Structure formats: structure tokens, C-alpha cells
Symmetry: D2
Subunit: 123 residues, 4 copies
């Protein structure tokens, strides 16, 4: 449901994700990272799949954050792909990819992969 996703979420590293799920499948908000060459909030945009999920199935979604704002420019972007699972303790379990802009020669080492779990606190 859009509502269920809308809110303030935090992950294990201490980063903040503030999101609004819109009626048409859109996700917009800001992300505050606790790691990296990140300073302040960054704009995020994503999409989620408005499932008829009468299976106890999670809702698939994903979003992107380009690490550039008015204070810093890290020349990198991260995409998180995962699913939202609601209940008393709603969680968003994700796997992410962080690509840094590089010269052709270092391209082979341009992408990091990891996983983050988000816990909701506010709507």
C-alpha cells in the first residue's frame, strides 16, 4: 500500500530514508547517509509495484540516490532493490549497487554491492 511505505525509515548503519509512495507507483523523498563522502540530504526517486499481494508476499520496489547535492559531489550513485514487508514491525529488505564514475581502465572496479534492512519509525 503506498501509505505503509510512506514514512521515515533507518537502516543498521544509521542512515535515514524519508519517503512518500504516490498513487501511481512513484517513490520520492530524501536520503541522509551515515557513511561515504556524503553530507546532508540527497534526493531519491524510485518506483514500487502496487501488488494485489494477498499472499503474505512483499511489495517489490527500488530507488536511486545520486550522491550530489549543494554541499558535496561524490560522482557516484546507489540503487536499492528489495521488498517491503508490513505488519507490526514493517521492514524493507534490500540489496544495493553503488557505482562510481571511473576511467575505462578502472571500470572493472566501479561497483560495490551490499545489503541493508530498513526499520520504519514514522509515517
Amino acid at each position: 500500500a503506498e501509505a505503509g511505505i510512506t514514512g521515515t525509515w533507518y537502516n543498521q548503519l544509521g542512515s535515514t530514508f524519508i519517503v512518500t509512495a504516490g498513487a501511481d507507483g512513484a517513490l520520492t523523498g530524501t536520503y541522509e547517509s551515515a557513511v561515504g563522502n556524503a553530507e546532508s540530504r540527497y534526493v531519491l526517486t524510485g518506483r514500487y509495484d502496487s501488488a494485489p499481494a494477498t499472499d503474505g508476499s512483499g511489495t517489490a520496489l527500488g530507488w536511486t540516490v545520486a550522491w550530489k547535492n549543494n554541499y558535496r559531489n561524490a560522482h557516484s550513485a546507489t540503487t536499492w532493490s528489495g521488498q517491503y514487508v508490513g505488519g507490526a514491525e514493517a521492514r524493507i529488505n534490500t540489496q544495493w549497487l553503488l557505482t562510481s564514475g571511473t576511467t575505462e581502465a578502472n571500470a572493472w572496479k566501479s561497483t560495490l554491492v551490499g545489503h541493508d534492512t530498513f526499520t520504519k519509525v514514522k509515517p
Copy 2:
């Protein structure tokens, strides 16, 4: 860098990506697939990190497509993370993650990973 991302791109599988890069970091457009429980165009939204301009590196970007439109609902979403490189032959080199909505029981096997290279040819 910048502007050059705007246009129509194609991947090795035959999927087409039509994007508009906005001056402040936004990416908007539509994605038409070649594989999957897909059927027609899907909305895509993303972000790119624009700035330097001089020689160097590619431009980092990422975007998402939830596979639900007026025709199909595959209950999944794909995110591509990569970098744009322009020049005589511009390309976007990406690695993607495709997550399907599952029950916890199948959660361990919900995400596929791959890579795609897009060109305007």
C-alpha cells in the same frame, strides 16, 4: 556528460529505454522490454550525478522500473546502476538487480543479478 544521456537506447536483448535527463540530476522516461512477464512500456525514474565536464570518467546514474502497467503486473522491480560514457560511440554500462515480491519462505531466492550494456544503435 550531461545532455548526451537523453535519447533512445537499446540493450543486447532488444529492450528500448527512452530517457530525458533534466539539468538538476533527474532521469525520466519509459522502458519497453524484450524478456520477462512484461508487456509494452513501463515508467522509469532515476538520477545521474552530473558535474565535471573535462575528459576523465563516466557519469554515474541509476534508475528503477516496477513491472506493473495497465496490462501486466509481474510483482517485481528492477534497478540498474552504472555509468554513461559518451564519445563517437556512447554507452551506458550497467549491472542490475531484479527483486520479485515473495513470501518469507522464498525470500532467499527473490533477487536476480545481471549486467546490460545500452547503445543508441
Copy 3:
């Protein structure tokens, strides 16, 4: 240290990993999976990097399991890449890739990615 890694380990899904770290960087053992089209034990082989790790740094390692034994043949293989962290509660944190043999047309969907954390019980 090889010893530290040698032992019986379990992950959150309930699978068993029995390993022996050898002096030359080798890892051999058996793996018992709790999920998949897996039945019984499967042979595993890997390598670890005998670090001078006087940094409180983890030990990098990796191993592979081809899901075929005398009882089942799943036509797939999994590789786990991660690091061993010792202490009172020794853990091996990993990220894995599971590739299934497929026809050329379905190759785009041949690989799954995930993460597993192993807790040691025995040597």
C-alpha cells in the same frame, strides 16, 4: 588463522558448513543446505587469504558448492565470497551468487544473489 576457520558453522536458513582450512590457503569440507533442490551433503572447495591481519581486519575467503551429489543433481553452483571475523562469537559474513545452467535465451535470468552470515559452533 586456519584453525579459527576450521569447524562446523550454521547460517540463518539452517544450513551446515563443515570446513577444514589447510596451511597452504585451501578450504575443503561439505555443505548441507536447508533450501533448494538439495538432498544430503555436497562437497565444497575454496581458498582463504592467510592475512597478517594485525588490524582487526577480517580474513577474506570464498568457496564453491556444485549442487550435484549421488542423490541429486540441480545443475547449478553457488559461490560465497566474504570474510571471517574471529573473537568470542566468530562469524563469516558472505554474499553469494547461485548460477543455474540454462539455454542461451534464459541466460539473462541464470543468477541469484544473496547474503548469509555463519556462526561457528564446533571446530
Copy 4:
């Protein structure tokens, strides 16, 4: 399928892989890199799933290389997961994970991911 994996392979970067596939699933050989904090040959060990034989699919396999030899110790290890396809032009298509040993503080950024295609050309 089977046998055909044995030989010397090369990836787009210029690294060379020399492997022996044993009749019961084992993979042994040496890997010589083109990039990294690498210097010469490194030992590799892996497994492949052999069986069917008739038309179809590729053969699933995987292998690991810890980047430590008598010359260098990069305190990292790489695992490649993929499938072998033979025919007039045989290839091994893989996706890899490279993990470096870090302190917990940098654990979030310890693993790189990529893909490599190896040919005997």
C-alpha cells in the same frame, strides 16, 4: 559439456585461467591476472555440475582465487559463478564477487561485483 572446460582461457581484461576439470566435479588450475594488487600466478580451486550431455544448457561452475602468493598478499579473494557453453566458440560467462578483508567500519564497502566472459582465444 564435461572435458571441454579443461584448457587455457582468457578474459576481456587479458587475465589467463588454466584449468583441469576432473571427472567427478573438481576444478583446479592457476589464474594469472591483468589488474589488481596481483603479481603472477595464483592457485584456483572450484567445482562444476556435470551430467546431462544432450543439447540444452550450459554447465554451471564456480571457483575461487585468494590473492596471496609468494610475491603479493592483497588480503582479498574473488569467486566467479557462471556457466560454460561449448560449441565452435566455447565460453564461460561469469559474474564475480571480490571481497577485501576490512575492519567492521569499512565492512559495508568490502565487496565489488562485476562480470567476465572467458574464451580460449
